[PDB]
Design a protein around this ligand. Sequence first.
Ligand SMILES: Nc1ncnc2c1ncn2[C@@H]1O[C@H](COP(=O)(O)OP(=O)(O)OP(O)(O)=S)[C@@H](O)[C@H]1O
Ligand SMILES: Nc1ncnc2c1ncn2[C@@H]1O[C@H](COP(=O)(O)OP(=O)(O)OP(O)(O)=S)[C@@H](O)[C@H]1O
Ligand SMILES: Nc1ncnc2c1ncn2[C@@H]1O[C@H](COP(=O)(O)OP(=O)(O)OP(O)(O)=S)[C@@H](O)[C@H]1O
Ligand SMILES: Nc1ncnc2c1ncn2[C@@H]1O[C@H](COP(=O)(O)OP(=O)(O)OP(O)(O)=S)[C@@H](O)[C@H]1O
Ligand SMILES: [Mg+2]
Ligand SMILES: [Mg+2]
Ligand SMILES: [Mg+2]
Ligand SMILES: [Mg+2]
Lengths: 206, 623, 140
Amino acid sequence: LAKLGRNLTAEAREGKLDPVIGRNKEIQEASEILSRRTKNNPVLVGDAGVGKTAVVEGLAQAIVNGDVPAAIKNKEIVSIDISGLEAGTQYRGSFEENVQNLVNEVKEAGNIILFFDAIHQILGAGSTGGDSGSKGLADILKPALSRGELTVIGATTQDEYRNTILKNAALARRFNEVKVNAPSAENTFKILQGIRDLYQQHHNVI
Amino acid sequence: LAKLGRNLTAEAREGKLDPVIGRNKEIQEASEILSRRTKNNPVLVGDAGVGKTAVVEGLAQAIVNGDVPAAIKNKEIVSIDISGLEAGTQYRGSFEENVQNLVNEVKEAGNIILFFDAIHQILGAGSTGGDSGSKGLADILKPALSRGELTVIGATTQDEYRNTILKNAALARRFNEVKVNAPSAENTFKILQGIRDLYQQHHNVILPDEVLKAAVDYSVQYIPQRSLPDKAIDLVDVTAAHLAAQHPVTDVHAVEREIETEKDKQEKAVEAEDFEAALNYKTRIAELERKIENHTEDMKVTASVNDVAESVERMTGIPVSQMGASDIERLKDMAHRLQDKVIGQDKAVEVVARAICRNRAGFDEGNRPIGNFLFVGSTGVGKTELAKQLALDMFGTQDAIIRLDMSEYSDRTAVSKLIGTTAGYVGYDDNSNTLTERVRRNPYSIILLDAIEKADPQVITLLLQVLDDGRLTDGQGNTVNFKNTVIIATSNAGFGYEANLTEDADKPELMDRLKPFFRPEFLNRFNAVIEFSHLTKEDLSKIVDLMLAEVNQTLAKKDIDLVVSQAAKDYITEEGYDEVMGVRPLRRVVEQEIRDKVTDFHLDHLDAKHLEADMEDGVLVIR
Amino acid sequence: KAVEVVARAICRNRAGFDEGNRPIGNFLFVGSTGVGKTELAKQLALDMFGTQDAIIRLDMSEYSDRTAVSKLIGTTAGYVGYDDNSNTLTERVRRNPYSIILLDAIEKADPQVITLLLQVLDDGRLTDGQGNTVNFKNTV
Ligand SMILES: Nc1ncnc2c1ncn2[C@@H]1O[C@H](COP(=O)(O)OP(=O)(O)OP(O)(O)=S)[C@@H](O)[C@H]1O
Ligand SMILES: Nc1ncnc2c1ncn2[C@@H]1O[C@H](COP(=O)(O)OP(=O)(O)OP(O)(O)=S)[C@@H](O)[C@H]1O
Ligand SMILES: Nc1ncnc2c1ncn2[C@@H]1O[C@H](COP(=O)(O)OP(=O)(O)OP(O)(O)=S)[C@@H](O)[C@H]1O
Ligand SMILES: Nc1ncnc2c1ncn2[C@@H]1O[C@H](COP(=O)(O)OP(=O)(O)OP(O)(O)=S)[C@@H](O)[C@H]1O
Ligand SMILES: [Mg+2]
Ligand SMILES: [Mg+2]
Ligand SMILES: [Mg+2]
Ligand SMILES: [Mg+2]
């Protein structure tokens, strides 16, 4: 791995990741999509600043925990710096070759699962948004997802979803959506209690 | 071979391919085209999700089987990734060289036959579709097919066919078409029975036939916007995934770790040649192993029609009373279903229900749109009732309608709500992702046109194209079908209200006025017109308790129950009986007055169960 | 009266009593200028948002296009175009989905923009010049 991305499962094994709190059904409901043979591309929808990624780290935690159903026991999750992909290369033709080389890497029993955070930044390689765009997964994914090569997970906001996703019928027959909402002022209190110790850094009252 | 493609015949020899079921004539009829010396390029036409490729795999199966006529005994079939062809090369000139190198490979007695799945994706290398395209077979095939070099097979959809294929005469003198249709709910049952064993994967019940036929019967009646074979499968798939019930695996995973540790210690003892300890370790390994075996078989096997039902409910958000009811039941019960969510006006209910049943049962001859109806009256009559409740009951969601208020739609004067010319408007409809884009996306949706005397455009004839046959051309010449859509348009039937003394004076008190208002020909084109003359006082208590119901529903979010006295109801009715235009003030009088009191009562310290509202001289008093 | 109405409406929206899918509040104020006509534009805005800088105001009468004079250029129709494709109306409202928008003196100009507003005035979802819909749920 370790090419413009990070293995979250590897960190999870080490215990380097904070416990995800109060997200119970919302996380494992996600498994209810992944376990299917087709129609298996869940995206988390909601506004920013809601612990959006915290769901997927909690998913990795559960996978290590043996909480998941048997369908996804043997897989791992890698998060990808979409926005910095062109940083890894000098020429965009070489860029596209490296991009397809990812699919080339994605043959290991599907044990690799790609995660992102800006789906609109994925839907490029064309005029999916704005006036133009640089080459990206779009010109490669459209078949690959149709032919079941990949499984991606999220993630984006409400308006991005209705403006970009519901317009390409190709995604319609592969993708699914999961609602995310900010919690109440009890779980927030719990999360803050969890973080509390971090700010020993500032040599003031905890 | 093995260059951006796959030999299906090779897999067929190995028995790696599933048996194709129920496609008998449709497959071997294909041979009747291939056996010819010329005119030998069959393409399969039809909608997606119908087992479109399954035909060609069945053809390969038959070829191996010796079912075919002698003409094609010695050939094989290769399927090609058209869309990924540029993936195999870096430079598109090198790409074209590789493409022609395919023809170079295609010299082996014609034993190779090319198969594809996106003919429009083949017809590239030029402006055959869209604005531009990358180089492809087009600049090479056009002669090769003319000079008989290749034989290709399919495949694409109906609209692709009429829009791209019938326009190049070169293809006309080489190509042929074969119709494909989804099968009935017996062969589908067979195919599902065949697949059934695959889902041992999910360690749940392998499903009894009753659940399967129930899934078919539900998907057919609740999701018409999809083809039968795929939707029946997907329903089962999601059903199984949910029936996994999100069970964990740690309850066996921990002992897997234990077996690993014991195995390591066993290896260590074997290193030291201490055979008693290794024997004990092996015994413990067997112990834990068959324990895990026992846990593994602790799978719940419960396929229930009910579980499929909640899966459906999650699919569409619609709880279903009387699940499994016959269509005979449903087509009559929907009469009340809409009747009891609206108030009176039973004529519209009757007309709409009968028309819907005719379309659903297939009694009416095809080649006409589903329904085209006019509704003429004032606004405050629930004028949009059939836009919301009818739409939702039809489609498991009200979000199946697009509405244009045609009067305000068009262009009248250079004011900052509308820009351009009314003529410009038709242009938008015929070249831009505003009308044609959407209708082709949801060929079952409902379109609503408000108040249509009414604007600058006298668009009667432009609609007649669909109003005759549902086929209507765009600004590029492409025709869109309107077979499965509903068109509802509205108008003004005059207005009172005194209240009911002038709600309806006579039958021609309407049409004779509408004769200078609506052109008689545009009238004669419709299935029916219905009117909204309905505004009274005795039947308005029913809407009163309807809003009271939604009020308590809203309160249910905070575990609050409100009780309303009958005298309060009478006073509210009298308040809202500004019976001059409609029922908007009827909602308005409780729009804030109830919730304003609720605001202050919520500052309590409140018995949410006890809140009962009554009337003191026109003042709301709640305890 | 204005204090009463505004306070009760604000409480209803804040407490969540009113059913959703409607904008926060849509109110009309009709009178002369020298009455503190902009009082609720300044003090109400500031109390609502910890700062008065939460409002965008368009004097719709002077907003539109009437005659080729050097305070306004183009056609009144052109104006709706600006609102639906340019970083003047849709840009901003999506940036501060809680902001307050004020329309001065609205008989009043060439445009009879009643229906174009009804889209929000019904449900707060309103399309742009590109087809994108913007929500107006949390605005006044
Ligand atoms: N259940 C939780 N347990 C612990 N921390 C949480 C939890 N929910 C949210 N957080 C914190 O809130 C932050 C919000 O970030 P996320 O929404 O996951 O993504 P982000 O990159 O941090 O910013 P956004 O919100 O995605 S634009 C997280 O990074 C955590 O630090
Ligand atoms: N007679 C049949 N026997 C077995 N499986 C079938 C049969 N008919 C359809 N199917 C299944 O239904 C699926 C529908 O796929 P096809 O229509 O052949 O092509 P596709 O690539 O799967 O998707 P489409 O429909 O072509 S867009 C097939 O892949 C099979 O799994
Ligand atoms: N048979 C009926 N007669 C009168 N009103 C009805 C009837 N059935 C339902 N209604 C109610 O009438 C109300 C009409 O008020 P609105 O909800 O504002 O719709 P509307 O204003 O009539 O639609 P427009 O946009 O003005 S044409 C709805 O709330 C319906 O619930
Ligand atoms: N209830 C009230 N009646 C009259 N004046 C008031 C009231 N409340 C506040 N005022 C003051 O009225 C003054 C109005 O004068 P301006 O500050 O010039 O605003 P304005 O000129 O009315 O707004 P425009 O642009 O002319 S509509 C403000 O300074 C307010 O402080
Ligand atoms: Mg994050
Ligand atoms: Mg197929
Ligand atoms: Mg209505
Ligand atoms: Mg003022």
